[PDB]
């Protein structure tokens, strides 16, 4: 289809240090993938979103809670696949 | 040996021998009188230009010949005949000739110009074969031989810039009087000839590598060197840090130990040819790449040899990283996108980086249990040991050589506009009408002369460069990609004249069409 | 050298290579992004395609000989250029060949 | 090399070139900025005018062979050194010739900066630490930098009375004039030659 | 070898040997400036001609000599002397010479043409002896040598037609730049000479 | 006099992205200009001022409102020219 895979689905970040990376760059295809698209499902506000239309995330300023992003890839010709990630952020 | 005898014939051959090609070209020139025979200085204090645009210099009445573009020698068929089956070319020797000089003199008597043939007036020509002068050639100026042979061209004016403290003149600012060189007086029957032999400059690589640089391995066998695959054992609960190494790779090619490195990089700005996907600022000069030299900023333009864009990103171009040749109907100020020719540079994607892209990411900190391994982003990169790269492509419009400046050190002296970096380039041939004064008064005067006879010259000029070709030695099976004309019912034939005789070069032709393996 | 490196061109003739002069057409209201190229330059010398590059650099610290325009710290060894060789730091001193100051 | 690169001087005689020792005269109250130069050095060896430079650098990641002192991520490919070539990323591996670690830091190794030869009983997928042979590269600590360490610090701003002299941290460094380095060691297992690719230019073609 | 010396004499003989006849002819020519020195293309889309009358081509400022009619060589007595007692004729060799070049230059100052003699101006002549060009000769055009020897004639203009898809230009349409051939600059004292030998073409059967 | 010219006088910055540059580096002279001096007329507080005594600005953290800076150049010998800039910052 366009098959996507996220880095783990499940991460464990220890407080106070909130700076992680979700690596959706191991997502495969039989051709090139035109773009990688990040979104967000859960989580509170006040985060510095950096480059949602790219491959490797640079996540900062994470409130301990439950974040849930989602990677979506687009083949040529267009085909989507949404695989999500969970951010179990604990003190 | 005039006056009733031609002092030379029209030679415009282009002969193709085995390993060498001799491209003669002859043009008709016309030299006016510049400055009315004065060494007027030029600076920026008259106009009052910007802080980075201050200059100081001099403007002679001499004029120079600049056969420093490739189409001054190669017809578009000869360029096609060269770039399709040649892995390289370099010049051996040139042979410059200047004949059939006619010195006219114009009388604008009562608003009617009556151009009268003058026979005793001379023309001074010298070739600066010892390099005492500023070498203005290779700065990519106009006033070359024209592309099409049936064009009369006008000779440039030789000015030169020296050192300045703004628009002032430091005590190192040299003044060059050009009648303080031995010229050669040429009447209407004489001719100027000299010869020149180039250095052993390397062949210009007129091929494109058919292999990537990070794809130089056998796709079947895996290596014997290991690497770190994993710094976290997945035992389905949490972190473990067991440091799992494993062999590879036949398939995980991005993580293997390579042997070489891609070339240097210095990022330009990613600018779309489509206007809707550009920032609404200006931009340029705000987000451009530029360098401080003596406290004044200058755009790099076109910078180091880098590729123009990634795979299938034809709309993007580096802000100043491409040759942008003008078409006709293109003014010298604020022309639109259609009337220019942005040279797409994509055949060097194998070795060279992309000019709109980072050259990798180094690490910043020390990783531990406490701090995460933060990495920094590399933008500019000087040459590391083990870097390979490939120089900038040449074009049918673009320049042939440049002068390596006589400094104490220089790193890889290829000119950034492409071409052959020469220590001893072809010498500047400077030409000037000898000033013939009008009638002096009967009493002696101390003041020099405020009245000359208005005159100009014309004549022909032959330049004959012998090149040295590098015949290909390929064992490729499938056909190559070669420069072909568009076979279609067309309105006008490309690289030809029009309904009213305007030679229009439609597109920039590179030279990298053949494939050598890396 | 009696010529600069970014001043190696004929101050009279303009080049045949173009470049991007403007990424925003001034139609007196707002942004347009029409990507205006234009030829040059005889006068806009800072934006032309040069051919060579200035040498390598490795920044030192700008220190005044006049004591009133220096920071009140020490400085040196705090803000100096230095290199790690086998885990011990050493000031470059005098470093690569660079000019001392501007005009 | 039995001598360091920043230890190429007579340990007895002091130099004739001066340098800036102090930008703040201690008159026991506050700042003065008297710009004290002094000669040296027989003993203050870190501040002398040297003559050469250590080689190029391109930082890898400091990874412990002991699993308890590594981050709990993965890592590699997240914090690795890699390059974009035609829009696809590739780990450098092993990169330029650099030393493996500092003095008495045998537990650390660059993430991809060492030859890692496999033993027997080592599969071609996800082998543990015991069945491989990480080649420690420490004999070139004299000329070459450490692959897990910065290659010095340049300055960023202009120091004045208003702004403090902030310095930036160098990580990657292309070749300056006056750099000396030494190429990567060979091994009984490792390769003998390689082909210099037929390009138009190449800088120091050692594999 | 000018300027005060003729660079050739007027030869207009016609000698009758036994088995060969040598017919010299000399004419006075006049070459104007065509297109004002431009390679203007010519096609049918400007006029808008018929479907069988579409063409596409180019029109140089060059001019050609076309001595390709029989009366450029034979006077009517020499033709009568030939056709009455000969069962055939064929040419062996020709010999072309071009001399006494005068390059005038005209000034139409205030509606009055004042033709002034120019001495330093040249004239380019080349003979396309390798056949890289379109061969317009033999298409039965005008602009030959005149029949009667005491006639000044005007040189034609060399244009050529190439392939077309109507009044368009297919990608096989060749363009020939004619200064991309080695010409010969001729002042007012020089002269162009070359020689040529015909093939062993069969005799033209001049009998019934 | 010392004639100065600012990059535009009139800019249009869209929210949330507040990071602009006023380029007072096209200001001319017949000699060198010794320094370029930026000031401020209008606008609210809480901005990170970076290098007011330089050529190219680096403006950050812009409240949507009306900022008005002013460039002043100094020739050798001393001559001033104050040309201002307006920052029409809108959402």
Residue numbers in the entry:
A (entry chain R), F (entry chain R): 407 to 497
B (entry chain A): 219 to 736
C (entry chain A): 427 to 529
D (entry chain A): 427 to 633
E (entry chain A): 219 to 426
Paper text:
Adeno-associated viruses (AAVs) belong to the Dependoparvovirus genus within the Parvoviridae family. Because of the broad differences in their tissue tropism and transduction efficiency and the absence of pathology, AAVs are the promising vehicles for therapeutic gene delivery. To dissect the divergent rules of engagements between multiple AAV serotypes with AAVR, we select two AAV serotypes, AAV1 and AAV5, and solve the atomic structures of their complexes with AAVR by cryo-EM.
The cryo-EM maps show that AAVR PKD2 alone (without PKD1) contacts AAV1 being similar to the AAV2-AAVR complex, while PKD1 directly binds at a completely distinct position on the AAV5 capsid. Similar to the binding of PKD2 to the AAV2 capsid, PKD2 lies on the plateau region of the AAV1 capsid and interacts with the inner rim of the spike surrounding the icosahedral threefold axis. Each PKD2 molecule contacts two AAV1 capsomers. Residues in strands B/C/E and the BC loop of PKD2 interact with the AAV1 capsid. The βBC1-βC loop (including residues AAV1A263, AAV1G266, AAV1A267, AAV1S268, AAV1N269, and AAV1H272) and the βEF2-ɑEF3 loop (AAV1N383, AAV1G384, AAV1S385, and AAV1Q386) of capsomer A stack with strands B and C and the BC loop spanning residues AAVRS425-AAVRY442 of PKD2. The binding of PKD2 to the AAV1 capsid resulted in a conformational change at the βGH9-ɑGH10 loop, which is the counterpart of the βGH2-βGH3 loop of AAV2 and has conformational movement upon AAVR binding. The mutation of AAV1N269 and AAV1T504 completely eliminated AAV1 transduction, and the AAV1W503A and AAV1D590A mutations attenuated transduction to 30–40% of that observed for wt AAV1. These results are consistent with the structural observations that these four AAV1 capsid residues form extensive intermolecular contacts with AAVRV427, AAVRD429, AAVRS431, AAVRQ432, AAVRS433, AAVRT434, AAVRI439, and AAVRY442 in PKD2.
